[PDB]
Design an enzyme around this catalytic site. Structure first.
Site, PDB file in Angstrom:
ATOM      1  N   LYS A 131      24.888  57.073 -15.601  1.00 37.81           N
ATOM      2  CA  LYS A 131      25.947  57.624 -14.771  1.00 37.81           C
ATOM      3  C   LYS A 131      27.304  57.641 -15.461  1.00 37.81           C
ATOM      4  CE  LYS A 131      23.717  55.861 -10.652  1.00 37.81           C
ATOM      5  NZ  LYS A 131      23.861  55.145  -9.357  1.00 37.81           N
ATOM      6  N   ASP A 174      24.187  47.266  -1.325  1.00 33.46           N
ATOM      7  CA  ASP A 174      24.014  48.667  -0.979  1.00 33.46           C
ATOM      8  C   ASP A 174      22.590  49.089  -1.300  1.00 33.46           C
ATOM      9  OD1 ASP A 174      24.099  51.332  -0.447  1.00 33.46           O
ATOM     10  OD2 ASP A 174      25.709  51.817  -1.853  1.00 33.46           O
ATOM     11  N   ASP A 183      25.985  51.526 -11.960  1.00 33.85           N
ATOM     12  CA  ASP A 183      24.603  51.099 -11.798  1.00 33.85           C
ATOM     13  C   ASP A 183      23.683  52.184 -12.350  1.00 33.85           C
ATOM     14  OD1 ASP A 183      24.830  53.075  -9.908  1.00 33.85           O
ATOM     15  OD2 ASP A 183      23.685  51.999  -8.384  1.00 33.85           O
ATOM     16  N   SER A 239      22.171  51.600  -4.418  1.00 39.63           N
ATOM     17  CA  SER A 239      22.506  51.107  -5.745  1.00 39.63           C
ATOM     18  C   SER A 239      21.527  50.016  -6.145  1.00 39.63           C
ATOM     19  CB  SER A 239      23.938  50.562  -5.784  1.00 39.63           C
ATOM     20  OG  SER A 239      24.837  51.462  -5.165  1.00 39.63           O
ATOM     21  N   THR A 278      24.917  53.980  -5.217  1.00 37.93           N
ATOM     22  CA  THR A 278      25.809  54.372  -6.300  1.00 37.93           C
ATOM     23  C   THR A 278      27.079  53.539  -6.297  1.00 37.93           C
ATOM     24  OG1 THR A 278      25.070  56.623  -5.783  1.00 37.93           O
ATOM     25  CG2 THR A 278      26.704  56.358  -7.546  1.00 37.93           C
ATOM     26  N   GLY A 283      27.740  60.960  -6.360  1.00 37.62           N
ATOM     27  CA  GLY A 283      27.502  62.073  -5.458  1.00 37.62           C
ATOM     28  C   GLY A 283      26.234  62.827  -5.835  1.00 37.62           C
ATOM     29  N   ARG A 301      20.595  54.018 -10.668  1.00 40.26           N
ATOM     30  CA  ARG A 301      19.640  54.316  -9.612  1.00 40.26           C
ATOM     31  C   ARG A 301      20.033  55.626  -8.951  1.00 40.26           C
ATOM     32  NH1 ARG A 301      18.054  50.433  -4.450  1.00 40.26           N
ATOM     33  NH2 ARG A 301      16.582  49.605  -5.995  1.00 40.26           N
ATOM     34  N   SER A 304      28.536  55.023  -2.867  1.00 37.85           N
ATOM     35  CA  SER A 304      28.154  54.356  -1.630  1.00 37.85           C
ATOM     36  C   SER A 304      28.487  52.871  -1.656  1.00 37.85           C
ATOM     37  CB  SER A 304      26.660  54.550  -1.367  1.00 37.85           C
ATOM     38  OG  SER A 304      25.885  54.056  -2.443  1.00 37.85           O
TER      39      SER A 304
HETATM   40  C1  LIG Z   1      24.540  61.061 -11.265  1.00 36.23           C
HETATM   41  C2  LIG Z   1      24.561  60.333  -9.926  1.00 36.23           C
HETATM   42  C3  LIG Z   1      25.175  61.224  -8.852  1.00 36.23           C
HETATM   43  C4  LIG Z   1      23.162  59.866  -9.513  1.00 36.23           C
HETATM   44  C5  LIG Z   1      23.027  59.286  -8.102  1.00 36.23           C
HETATM   45  C6  LIG Z   1      24.178  58.364  -7.798  1.00 36.23           C
HETATM   46  O1  LIG Z   1      24.826  58.408  -6.788  1.00 36.23           O
HETATM   47  N1  LIG Z   1      22.893  60.278  -7.072  1.00 36.23           N
HETATM   48  C7  LIG Z   1      22.016  60.151  -6.069  1.00 36.23           C
HETATM   49  O2  LIG Z   1      21.257  59.205  -5.945  1.00 36.23           O
HETATM   50  C8  LIG Z   1      22.008  61.289  -5.058  1.00 36.23           C
HETATM   51  C9  LIG Z   1      22.105  60.676  -3.660  1.00 36.23           C
HETATM   52  C10 LIG Z   1      22.805  61.537  -2.610  1.00 36.23           C
HETATM   53  C11 LIG Z   1      22.571  60.938  -1.228  1.00 36.23           C
HETATM   54  C12 LIG Z   1      24.300  61.683  -2.872  1.00 36.23           C
HETATM   55  N2  LIG Z   1      20.791  62.044  -5.241  1.00 36.23           N
HETATM   56  C13 LIG Z   1      20.715  63.222  -5.875  1.00 36.23           C
HETATM   57  O3  LIG Z   1      21.673  63.793  -6.371  1.00 36.23           O
HETATM   58  C14 LIG Z   1      19.328  63.850  -5.940  1.00 36.23           C
HETATM   59  C15 LIG Z   1      18.778  63.826  -7.375  1.00 36.23           C
HETATM   60  C16 LIG Z   1      17.995  62.582  -7.791  1.00 36.23           C
HETATM   61  C17 LIG Z   1      16.504  62.862  -7.644  1.00 36.23           C
HETATM   62  C18 LIG Z   1      18.294  62.161  -9.226  1.00 36.23           C
HETATM   63  N3  LIG Z   1      19.479  65.204  -5.469  1.00 36.23           N
HETATM   64  C19 LIG Z   1      18.843  65.657  -4.376  1.00 36.23           C
HETATM   65  O4  LIG Z   1      18.059  65.020  -3.701  1.00 36.23           O
HETATM   66  O5  LIG Z   1      19.200  66.919  -4.115  1.00 36.23           O
HETATM   67  C20 LIG Z   1      19.421  67.255  -2.741  1.00 36.23           C
HETATM   68  C21 LIG Z   1      20.446  68.347  -2.718  1.00 36.23           C
HETATM   69  C22 LIG Z   1      20.062  69.676  -2.582  1.00 36.23           C
HETATM   70  C23 LIG Z   1      21.012  70.689  -2.561  1.00 36.23           C
HETATM   71  C24 LIG Z   1      22.358  70.375  -2.676  1.00 36.23           C
HETATM   72  C25 LIG Z   1      22.751  69.049  -2.812  1.00 36.23           C
HETATM   73  C26 LIG Z   1      21.799  68.043  -2.832  1.00 36.23           C
END
Ligand SMILES: CC(C)C[C@@H](C=O)NC(=O)[C@H](CC(C)C)NC(=O)[C@H](CC(C)C)NC(=O)OCc1ccccc1
Ligand SMILES: CC(C)C[C@@H](C=O)NC(=O)[C@H](CC(C)C)NC(=O)[C@H](CC(C)C)NC(=O)OCc1ccccc1
Lengths: 247, 229, 202, 204, 196, 232, 240, 220
Positions: free
Chosen positions: H33, H166, H17, H169, H1, H47, H19, H129
């Site tokens: 995003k 990263d 980005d 991202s 991210t 996040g 992803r 990140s």
């Molecule tokens: C809109 C943006 C936040 C999208 C993206 C950019 O950072 N977020 C992400 O990639 C984060 C990564 C995480 C390590 C912070 N992932 C997520 O938010 C993913 C959802 C994707 C399948 C779309 N959520 C997920 O895996 O849920 C786990 C979870 C379960 C309970 C509470 C909090 C988090």
């Protein structure tokens, strides 16, 4: 404040609930709702009161509501009060489906709503719901059914009944021309048109003042349909021909 | 605390007099007109101030609810403002849940529901206002009215306020189903002129139009051009 | 973090560094840690960024409403009291050390220290933050009674420059504010303007 | 770990004017299989299906709660819900329990009731919508499903080719997963028909 | 752990359960009944944490009986199973969850026999046969081997005896006797206990 | 929350709201009940067949539990509410006492519910009087009557609703050990008592019986006609 | 026309013509004070002028005032019952402070008038309480719209004005101001204050002494609300 | 991210980005995003994806209600204040890292809101990140009062660095230019990474799959 309180939920010196009685009086000034039970199915026929030339018909129906996948109802009285009760009915039916994963039996749905109406007449200090309803539905316990509920909270099953304007005249006619157990959907529709024709005094059944809905079972699934304008017109034409031949 | 008993009850004849009296307040209100065109809806109303001191642009009567819904009233302004606020909240709550603009019919039902609560709840009088709601959903115009009693109707054209019975008669003779928006605006202005009782300027009337582009309130310059034509 | 406040006859002088960190990463290197609570009242924020900003906004709202009700300027003591009530009540949840300095007609320039836990005490000069531990000896040695506004500004700049030099959580630029009856004069020292002390050579 | 307690796998795919949704049949508690006819794909409309994977109790609770809300919405609106609106309703339902969520990751597949345009989407267990034009996977064998779908999917596939691609992806993905499998059910949603097929799969 | 088993036939459901109530290492009761009569054609078998089983089973029994008294007809087995699942699932995330594993057996006039499996997580499932407890790990394979959809009730009792005998030979816990019941269109019939 | 005092005392010490509720009961349909040696019978005067009303949904005799049933006379909607509350109580007593309720126990519960509604805030007294009949575990038949005021008593034969005074006078003169000697004789006594009030007779009466260790049984219209003919 | 039914002259419920007599009586309670207030709007200034009656020399004149500061840039003049006015002024101060805390910028004058009007409308709809028998006039400088003058009333109706008045002589002042506004509207700061004072003097038929009126102004150059001193008032009075 | 924002001469350029990862596997290859707060305000999110979506949607709804009532354009400060006050109330449990930027009556304003409720008004910010990689480009090449084209190139390069340095991202680069009298939402502004062309054919010919049962349900 004591002075400004109306005391809606109290007994009259003659053991009568005046607010309930007055609400039923308001029912008699509303459109005419007709319900007939037949072996093939059930039907609801209602007289439309919003007949202005500038009104736009865009909704499903003016007075026919789908309460469930296998149930429907018609209302008579305060339109806004009817809207409140129709929402409660849909909530009650879905709550039963969520709990049991089976459609709510028709009698149970009517009893649930009638419990809400009774509560308003017993306590709370608020005016009762000035609306009376007709229900039609099918369930695996009793098949096709037809129910009527009043503002007082009372209810009962009927083979044919009418609420609203000229209800007494319609009831006496249905009593005369109803064939208990020998009715079909076709014959029920003809009787409904005949009763509506006579009950809607100062009218000629132009087919814009009547809404007809039929409930039937097809291939194991309940089908609720509102007759189109062409079908209603054909029914009226047949009734006119029969009356003319009866001379 | 507040009173917990309904102030609206049933008369022996079976009528809610308070609702009937509320409708009397609406009939005494300023004229309002709405027409459903073939490709849009037009809401027009009379905004006549008691003196030149009043700032015409201060407070509006044709207020938007969302990007595609408008609202005009006839009756008491303070009650109109309350319903305008509630309608905007209901539109936002719907959008949050469904991520789509609230359909015009759904907004009308919810607003009508609020009006119903105030005619049955305890220690409150009914709203002294009747609303006219215009919208554009699914490539189709919509026009609704919402009475103080919580009942709503779908109209092709209607008038509210003072001289509404005469206005409705005028609309019936003049309204045609196949109308462009521009023609509808002319008819709406003419309907108001039928009972204006004065000289009409862009500062004395308010006009709003809803179409595919959305709902917008016509600027005084635009109203000037329509009045000239 | 390094926040310092000095009191002179007529007003007060406030100072702070401009570093905000999230571990070893400098999220903001030009942060302003001097928050105007009122026209002639300031607060120096140390500790949690979120907690200090939230409390500062809350006190600003309370003090402004209080001042409007009573048609008179607020007292610096009152500003400190509101900070103390919040910090003491929510000491379990808050991580915020506050220095409240300002001028009011009744008492003149005052400096109040409100460390973690909700204590309140008035001081001739106050320091706080992560880097304040490295200049306790310097301020105790170089502070003299009856300094002037110019001397206090130099005193504060020197003290912060030393702390920023020896503290990894402090750095950037020095933000100074002098508050008196005339008004508030804000200053920023950066680059060569920061006091410099030569390093050894073994 | 909680997600792998009961196992399960769901995948949806997009074709030319058609969509496919597939799920495995196994229902088991950890290593023990209890039933090989468990339902995971539920009908939300004539051409709208939702497939749920994860904790079996949450799969049934979410489907029932969703149907409760969808039924009320259709009656109120007097119309069939659009696939996008259903995705938003599911996301709202899941996020209502962001703290202590339902342990399931729904995938939606259907055709828009008006223009019959294909639609597929996924949601995290807390209601994060994700709309794709290729495919979506969810379950204990997500990594295997991605590998098969990424290499096999092609654009503008007829219903016959779509069925082969989704079936091959599902069969070869569950075959390499322990707590998922024991049969595969595939629904091919076209404009005028729904074709439900059960595949011949390993039952070990 | 307590043991439950159920076999569904063309027009009947056969259910059995052990009759042991052990506190820590001593069998306090040797004739315990783990079957609850929901209605005239529904049985609920409950095993789990002490107190939770009876409290949950008795609560469901009262509600099902109340439904019968209110409406004049009894709940169907499918409706009762989903009603039980709803209550268990609702309490799952609350402060007082029920740790009970259930087997609901019943006969419907229209649908016919039904056997339902429900673990303490409130995951409902319909199976031709099912078992609960540690014995399930040991008897389930036997049922898979010898069960056919058209199994007569006489062969069902023989198959039930096979599973119980396997428990005697290979299970470590002492489960001497078992309670046996069968549900068909005539109601609930109490067969002779299978004892050893 | 509406919290006005609906029921209050008046000079001479009368609760008019309770009195008005009793007037509502009098305007209700007539109901009769007798306690036999081994049978308890309940009869109700049907208002009218109406030729189009489903008689299944207008029954004025309900079964609170397996061993208890009751009939009411007053506001139908109020009776439905009291019936549901009584049914829930019966199941609760079964749950926490592991035995069926007694007729006195459930009568006491209903009586307390009615009394509480006459001395509470924001509500009106119930407008029904109920006859509760059943068999205790000991097998002794029971018949109780409860008024809107919350009072209840044990009766060997009583009538409520319209024409209660006339029917009760009829029952007092023609109730004896000989009259209740046989189950059929007991049923005829109920029909004869009802016929003293209802005009048409036979068609416009609903009758139900409850025998020892047997569920509530509703006499079919043909059975009622046979009994009516025998009485004539 | 003047029909009544039930309790419609006692609580805020509709009369047979839908009139809300109780709200109308609240309007008439404004005149019980016996004072009048006038507000005018200029090219870059807004002025509020009100009477100042001191019945006895024992009263501390510094405390007998009807001009209140809501925020640093908003000021108001209250007409009607004193206790009701003070409560409304307190509510306005709370609303303005709350707005700033929540949205991060000073509340516009029109928005503040709207919120007070919304609060007042509730008293008319609910029958538990009575409407406030007071009228509020607010003045301020908008960052884009320039000077602003707004007026609330017990019924919850509010509007923006070029010039308005409240109290006993509201109608006479409105006629006077309407005549003046119909002419050119250059209205320099001196002209605005003079127009406000001459209007009040004309309707009240009195030549004001320097310590018989209160004047509050907001100007584009100095947006902060200011209350003119007795010396400043005298200078304006002498000039006119 | 990698989400970045820069304040240039005329307005604001926001970047991000596309992803999202669920663990260490790419879940969504094209995620939007850059969220919409109001016609003149946008907000990049990082996040927890659900938290960022819910937070921006709620504040956008509240601001739209605010804008309708006032009749004026919304202010960036108001959006920033609403976001931080809600986030602080949740004590950082709503994992929403935000880059808020818009042009209002007082000129361009760029903020950075952190999950715990701390905000920072800066001429350029980064979050996520890949935030450090983006900040390296900003510290190296940022200049005050840049032209629109120069600002777009800088933010695109900043997001590119995070994408290629990263593992959280990747994929396309989104941009959003906000000016006093313009708003360009360049969703696929650039596509640095593309999937390689398939070299072999694995089409499953009809009949390659065995089926046990089939059922066809025609629809009306
Ligand atoms: C809109 C943006 C936040 C999208 C993206 C950019 O950072 N977020 C992400 O990639 C984060 C990564 C995480 C390590 C912070 N992932 C997520 O938010 C993913 C959802 C994707 C399948 C779309 N959520 C997920 O895996 O849920 C786990 C979870 C379960 C309970 C509470 C909090 C988090
Ligand atoms: C007075 C202010 C300038 C605050 C400042 C004092 O110098 N505080 C700090 O520098 C402290 C230092 C820490 C060791 C306690 N850091 C903080 O308060 C940081 C600053 C954010 C901008 C990331 N806050 C923090 O760690 O929580 C916010 C957060 C939330 C999620 C992920 C990463 C960071």
């Amino acid at each position: 404040s004591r002075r400004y309180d109306s005391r809606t939920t109290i007994f009259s010196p003659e053991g009568r609930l005046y607010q309930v009685e007055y609400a039923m009086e308001a029912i008699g000034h509303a459109g005419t709702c007709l319900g007939i039970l037949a072996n093939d199915g059930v039907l609801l026929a209602a007289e439309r009161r919003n007949i202005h030339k500038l009104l736009d018909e865009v909704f499903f129906s003016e007075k026919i509501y789908k309460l469930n996948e296998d149930m429907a109802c018609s209302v008579a009285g305060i339109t806004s009060d009817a809207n409140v009760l129709t929402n409660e009915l849909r909530l009650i039916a879905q709550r039963y489906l969520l709990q049991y994963q089976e459609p709510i039996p028709c009698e149970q749905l009517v009893t649930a709503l009638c419990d809400i109406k009774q509560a308003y007449t017993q306590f709370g200090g608020k005016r009762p719901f000035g609306v009376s309803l007709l229900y039609i539905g099918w369930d695996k316990h009793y098949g096709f059914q037809l129910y009527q509920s009043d503002p007082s909270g009372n209810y009962g099953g009927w083979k044919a009944t009418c609420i609203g304007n000229n209800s007494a005249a319609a009831v006496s006619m249905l009593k005369q021309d109803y064939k208990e157990g020998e009715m079909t959907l076709k014959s029920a529709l003809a009787l409904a048109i005949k009763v509506l024709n006579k009950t809607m005094d100062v009218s000629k059944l132009s087919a814009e003042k009547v809404e007809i809905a039929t409930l039937t079972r097809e291939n194991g699934k309940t089908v609720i349909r509102v007759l189109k304008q062409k079908e209603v017109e054909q029914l009226i034409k047949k009734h006119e021909e029969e009356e003319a031949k009866a001379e | 605390r507040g009173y917990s008993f309904s102030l609206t009850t049933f008369s022996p004849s079976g009528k809610l007099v308070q609702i009937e009296y509320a409708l009397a307040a609406v009939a005494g209100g300023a004229p309002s007109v709405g027409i459903k065109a073939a490709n849009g809806v037009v809401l027009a109303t009379e905004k006549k101030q008691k003196s030149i001191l009043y700032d015409e642009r201060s407070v509006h009567k044709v207020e938007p609810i969302t990007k595609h819904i408008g609202l005009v009233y006839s009756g008491m302004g303070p009650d109109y403002r309350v319903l305008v606020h509630r309608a905007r909240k209901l539109a936002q709550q719907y959008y949050l849940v469904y991520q789509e603009p609230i359909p015009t019919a759904q907004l009308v039902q919810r607003v009508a529901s609020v009006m119903q609560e105030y005619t049955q709840s305890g220690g409150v009088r009914p709203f002294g206002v009747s609303l006219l709601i215009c919208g554009w959903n699914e490539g189709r115009p919509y026009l609704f009215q919402s009475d103080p009693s919580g009942a709503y109707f779908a109209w092709k054209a209607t008038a509210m306020g003072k001289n509404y019975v005469n206005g409705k008669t005028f609309l019936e003779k003049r309204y045609n189903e196949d109308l462009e928006l521009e023609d509808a605006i002319h008819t709406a202005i003419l309907t108001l002129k039928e009972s204006f009782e004065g000289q009409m300027t862009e500062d004395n009337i308010e006009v709003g139009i809803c179409n595919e582009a959305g709902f917008r309130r016509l600027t005084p310059t635009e109203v000037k051009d329509y009045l000239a034509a | 973090t390094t926040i310092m406040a000095v009191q002179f006859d007529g007003g007060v002088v406030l100072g702070a560094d401009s570093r905000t960190t999230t571990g070893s990463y400098i999220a903001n290197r030009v942060t302003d840690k001097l928050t105007p609570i009122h026209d002639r009242i300031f607060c120096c924020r140390s500790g949690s960024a979120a907690d200090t900003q939230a409390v500062a906004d809350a006190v600003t709202y309370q003090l402004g409403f209080h001042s409007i009700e009573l048609n008179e300027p607020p007292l610096v003591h009152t500003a400190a009291s509101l900070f103390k009530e919040m910090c003491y009540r929510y000491r379990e949840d808050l991580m915020a050390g506050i220095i409240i300095a300002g001028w009011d007609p009744q008492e003149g320039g005052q400096v109040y220290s409100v460390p973690m836990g909700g204590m309140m005490v008035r001081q001739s000069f106050a320091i706080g933050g992560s880097g304040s531990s490295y200049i306790y000896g310097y301020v105790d040695a170089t502070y003299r009674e009856g300094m002037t506004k110019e001397e206090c500004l130099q005193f504060t700049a020197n003290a912060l420059a030393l702390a920023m030099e020896r503290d990894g959580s402090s750095g950037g630029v020095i933000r100074l504010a002098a508050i008196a009856e005339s008004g508030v004069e804000r200053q920023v020292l950066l680059g060569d303007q920061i006091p410099k002390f030569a390093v050894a050579t073994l | 770990s909680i997600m792998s307690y009961n196992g399960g796998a769901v995948m949806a795919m997009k074709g030319k004017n058609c969509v496919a949704i597939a799920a495995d049949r196994r229902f088991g508690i950890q290593a023990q299989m209890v039933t090989t006819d468990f339902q995971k794909i539920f009908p939300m409309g004539d051409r709208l299906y939702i497939g749920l994977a994860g904790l079996a109790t949450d799969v049934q609770t979410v489907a029932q709660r969703l149907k409760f809300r969808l039924n009320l919405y259709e009656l109120k609106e007097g119309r069939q819900i659009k696939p996008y609106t259903l995705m938003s309703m599911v996301a709202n339902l899941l996020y209502e329990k962001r703290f202590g969520p339902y342990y399931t990751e729904p995938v939606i597949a259907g055709l828009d009731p008006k223009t019959f345009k294909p639609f597929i989407c996924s949601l995290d267990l807390i209601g994060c919508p994700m709309v794709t034009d290729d495919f979506v996977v969810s379950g204990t064998c997500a990594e295997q499903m991605y590998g098969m779908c990424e290499s096999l999917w092609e654009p503008n596939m007829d219903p016959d080719h779509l069925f082969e691609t989704i079936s091959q992806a599902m069969l070869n993905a569950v075959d390499r997963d322990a707590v998922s499998g024991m049969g595969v059910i595939v629904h091919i949603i076209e404009k005028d028909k729904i074709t439900t097929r059960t595949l011949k799969a390993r039952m070990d | 752990m307590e043991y439950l088993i159920g076999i569904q036939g063309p027009d009947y459901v056969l259910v059995a359960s052990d009759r042991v109530a052990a506190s820590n290492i001593v069998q306090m009761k040797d004739d315990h009944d783990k079957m609850f009569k929901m209605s005239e054609k529904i049985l609920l078998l409950c095993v789990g944490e002490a107190g939770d089983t009876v409290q949950f089973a008795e609560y469901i029994q009262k509600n099902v009986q109340l439904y019968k008294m209110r409406n004049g007809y009894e709940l169907s087995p499918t409706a009762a199973a989903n009603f039980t699942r709803r209550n268990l699932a609702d309490c799952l995330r609350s402060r007082t969850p029920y740790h009970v594993n259930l087997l609901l057996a019943g006969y419907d006039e229209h649908e016919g026999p039904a056997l339902y499996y429900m673990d303490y997580l409130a995951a409902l499932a319909k199976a031709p046969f099912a078992a609960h407890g540690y014995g399930a790990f040991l008897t389930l394979s036997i049922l898979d081997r010898y069960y056919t959809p058209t199994i007569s009730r006489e062969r069902a009792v023989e198959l039930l005896r096979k599973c119980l005998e396997e428990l005697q030979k290979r299970f470590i816990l002492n489960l001497p006797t078992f309670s046996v019941r069968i549900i068909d269109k005539n109601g609930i019939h109490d067969l002779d206990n299978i004892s050893f | 929350s509406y919290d006005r005092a609906i029921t209050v005392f008046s000079p001479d010490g009368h609760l008019f709201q309770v009195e008005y509720a009793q007037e509502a009961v009098k305007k209700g349909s007539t109901a009769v009940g007798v306690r036999g040696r081994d049978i308890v019978v309940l009869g109700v005067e049907k208002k009218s067949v109406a030729k189009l009303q489903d008689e299944r949904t207008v029954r004025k005799i309900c079964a609170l539990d397996d061993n208890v049933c009751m009939a009411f006379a007053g506001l139908t909607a109020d009776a439905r509410i009291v019936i549901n509350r009584a049914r829930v109580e019966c199941q609760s007593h079964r749950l926490t006492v592991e035995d069926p309720v007694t007729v006195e126990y459930i009568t006491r519960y209903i009586a307390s519910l009615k009394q509480r509604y006459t001395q509470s805030n924001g509500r009106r007294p119930f407008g029904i009087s109920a006859l509760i009949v059943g068999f205790d575990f000991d097998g002794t038949p029971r018949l109780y009557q409860t008024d809107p005021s919350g009072t209840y008593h044990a009766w060997k034969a009583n009538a409520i609703g319209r024409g209660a005074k006339s029917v009760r006078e009829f029952l007092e003169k023609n109730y004896t050990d000989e009259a209740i000697e046989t189950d059929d004789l007991t049923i005829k006594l109920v029909i004869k008592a009802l016929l003293e009030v209802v005009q048409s007779g036979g068609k416009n009466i609903e009758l139900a019986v409850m025998r020892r260790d047997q569920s509530l049984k509703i006499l079919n219209p043909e059975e009622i006609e046979k009994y009516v003919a025998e009485i004539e | 026309r003047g029909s009544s039914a039930g309790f419609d002259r006692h609580i805020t419920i509709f009369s047979p013509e839908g009139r809300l007599y109780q709200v109308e009586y609240a309007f008439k309670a404004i005149n019980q004070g016996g004072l009048t207030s006038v507000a005018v709007r200029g090219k870059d200034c807004a002025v509020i002028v009100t009477q100042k009656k001191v019945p006895d020399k024992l009263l501390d004149s510094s405390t007998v005032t009807h001009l209140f500061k809501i925020t640093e840039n908003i000021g108001c003049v209250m007409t009607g019952m004193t206790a009701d006015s003070r409560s409304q002024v307190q509510r306005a101060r709370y609303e303005a402070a709350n707005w700033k805390y929540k949205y991060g910028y000073e509340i516009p004058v029109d928005m503040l008038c709207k919120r007070i009007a919304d609060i007042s409308q509730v008293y008319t709809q609910n029958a538990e309480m009575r409407p406030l028998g007071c009228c509020m006039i607010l003045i301020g400088i908008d960052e884009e719209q320039g000077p602003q003058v707004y007026k609330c009333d017990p019924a919850g109706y509010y509007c923006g004005f070029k010039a308005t008045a409240a109290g006993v002589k509201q109608t006479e002042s409105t006629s006077f101001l309407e005549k003046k506004v119909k002419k050119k509207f250059d209205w320099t700061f001196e002209q605005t204050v003079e127009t406000a004072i001459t209007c009040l003097s004309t309707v009240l038929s009195i030549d004001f002494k320097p310590s018989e009126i209160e004047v509050g102004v907001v100007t584009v150059e100095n947006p902060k609300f200011r209350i003119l001193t007795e010396a400043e008032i005298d200078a304006h009075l002498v000039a006119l | 991210t990698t989400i970045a924002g820069v304040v240039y001469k005329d307005g604001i350029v926001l970047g991000a980005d596309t992803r999202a990862t669920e663990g260490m596997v790419v879940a969504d290859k094209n995620c939007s995003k850059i969220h919409f707060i109001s016609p003149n305000i946008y907000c990049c999110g990082a996040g927890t994806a659900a938290d960022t979506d819910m937070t921006t949607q709620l504040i956008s709804s509240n601001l739209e209600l605010h804008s309708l009532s006032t009749g004026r354009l919304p202010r960036v400060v108001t959006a920033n204040r609403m976001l931080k006050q809600m986030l602080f109330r949740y004590q950082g449990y709503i994992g929403a890292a935000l880059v808020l930027g818009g042009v209002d009556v007082t000129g361009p304003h760029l903020y950075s809101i952190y999950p715990h409720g701390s905000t920072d008004k800066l001429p350029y910010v980064t979050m996520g990140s890949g935030s450090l990689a983006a900040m390296a480009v900003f510290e190296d090449k940022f200049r005050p009062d840049m032209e629109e084209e120069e600002a777009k190139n800088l933010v695109s390069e900043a997001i590119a660095a995070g994408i290629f340095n990263d593992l959280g991202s990747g994929s396309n680069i989104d941009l959003c230019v906000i000016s006093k009298n313009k708003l360009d939402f360049l969703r696929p502004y650039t596509v640095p990474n593309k999937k390689g062309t398939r070299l072999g054919r694995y089409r499953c010919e009809k009949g390659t799959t065995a089926v046990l049962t089939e059922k066809i349900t025609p629809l009306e």
